[PDB]
Amino acid sequence: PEKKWLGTPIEEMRKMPRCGIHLPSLRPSASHTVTVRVDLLRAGEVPKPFPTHYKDLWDNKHVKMPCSEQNLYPVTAGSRWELIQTALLNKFTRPQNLKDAILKYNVAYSKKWDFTALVDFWDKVLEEAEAQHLYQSILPDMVKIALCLPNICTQPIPLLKQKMNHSVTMSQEQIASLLANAFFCTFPRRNAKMKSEYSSYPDINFNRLFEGRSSRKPEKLKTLFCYFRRVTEKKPTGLVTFTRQSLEDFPEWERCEKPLTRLHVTYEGTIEGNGRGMLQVDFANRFVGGGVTGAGLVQNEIRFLINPELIVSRLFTEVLDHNECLIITGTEQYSEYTGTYRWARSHEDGSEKDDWQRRCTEIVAIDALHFRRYLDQFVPEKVRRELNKAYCGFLRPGVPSENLSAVATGNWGCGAFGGDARLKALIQILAAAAAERDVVYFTFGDSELMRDIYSMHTFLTERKLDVGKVYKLLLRYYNEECRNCSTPGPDIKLYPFIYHAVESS
């Protein structure tokens, strides 16, 4: 029988907080927006906002806040924020009450936004007492934090545009207020099909969670209301950092002399459960979070539900270009799940916090390409694209490699997305090697794949092939077995080809 895991013992892999650099003082800079009072930051205390009082920017470089005095609506032109306040400061006893409240400041979508799934959740899925608690406690508490937005998020939030290398660090409390607003669909300029300014950003308002008959919707709502119940009953005290990273220069893959690093590979366990303290790869959509606020539940998006603070990145994160990723440090897990997705129960996150009061949970969104024609991914241009995407996700400029955790990852962009698991494993191993990080690879039930990955890594390591030598083998595979292949896949597979090439010298 196959073993459960192979390679380096997982406990010998580096992880946070132990491996981490000494953090300098948290402070704003040209590359770092910090929305809280750093001098008053104290463990277990809700951070205070900086500035003390709301300051507004309504322009193309910052989030358009719903509480802006430039957020106008027909009443003459009147305050949409005052209308939002009046709409939401009402008693809800039936789901149509919530629908009508939300539509008061979204009149243009009165017909276009269906609320069938919300109605069904409220009346059919919840028991009478659960529904009562929803509308007597949770929803009014959600309204309170949402309408406190100008007192909570006092500092303009910059848009993380393409090509920006920039960080935003905000409190979990600030994020809660932002997400309560997203639930009540209050963010202006984020709704229209013909959107101009925000066409290159993901949806943020939660309207599409309320629509349709999908049996998935009630499980999404359960998971989000678990979060909203938690943060309203006990205000979170941590910080979260969102960093856009955009690299212009990449390794010279054909000549790279860096050695392969360590590997732990296993067909049991999960990235979030067993990669604690490690850099956790989110198998992302280029629109980060993908369809999380609307339809379907695909590769990675479950993470955005169980760590819902990740969702707020959609407010300010432009669609990722090929050379870009988003790194999120400090999100908390609020829910556990089974499966077929179903909310199981709440989660009490036990992670330690770093010196900036950020939970030791680092997630990187990197989007694989889709391969609608299988052989496309072996073309050198496409191998390099994926290498560079992974490398951007793994690299930490100016951080010594000894202070970097192992990368916790798995079958990135494979299955129905068209990626070949064995190629993608080797691509991630090479990118990790170039960024000088070890790899913890979860195959999620596939024990033969675990063995095949371990066997290849062992062979390449023992024969002392560096990144460049392995890349050259991938080029040979393309040129000799793929370029002229007239069938969907070649007769000789990649790993067998690599073994024979090296063994024949």
Residue numbers in the entry: 442 to 516, 524 to 787, 791 to 956
List passages from the publication reporting this PDB structure.
Reversal of PARylation is predominantly carried out by poly(ADP-ribose) glycohydrolase (PARG) in nucleus and cytosol, whereas ADP-ribosylhydrolase 3 (ARH3) may play a role in mitochondrial PAR degradation. PARG comprises an N-terminal regulatory/targeting domain and a C-terminal catalytic domain. The mouse PARG catalytic domain has a bean-shaped structure, with the active site in a deep cleft in the middle on the abdominal side.
To understand what caused the activity difference between the mPARG E748N/Q and E749N/Q mutants, we solved the crystal structures of these mPARG mutants. Interestingly, while E748N and E749N mutants were completely dead, both E748Q and E749Q mutants still retained residual PARG activities. In contrast, the signature loops in E748N and E749N mutants have significantly different conformation from the wild type PARG. In wild-type PARG structure, Cβ and Cγ of both E748 and E749 residues are semi-buried. Mutation to Asn, which has both Cγ and Nγ linked to Cβ causes a spatial collision. Therefore, the conformation changes in this catalytic loop completely abolish activity of mPARG E748N and E749N mutants. To study the enzymatic mechanism of mPARG, we tried to soak the catalytic residue Glu748, Glu749 mutants E748N, E748Q, E749N and E749Q with the iso-ADPr, which may be the smallest PARG substrate containing the α(1→2) ribose-ribose glycosidic bond to be cleaved by PARG. In all above four PARG mutant crystal structures, we were not able to observe the electron density for iso-ADPr at the “active” site of mPARG. For E748N and E749N mutants, this may result from the conformational change in the active site associated with the mutation. Our work revealed precisely how some of the PARG mutations (e.g. E748N, E749N) disrupt the PARG activity through significant conformational changes in the PARG active site.
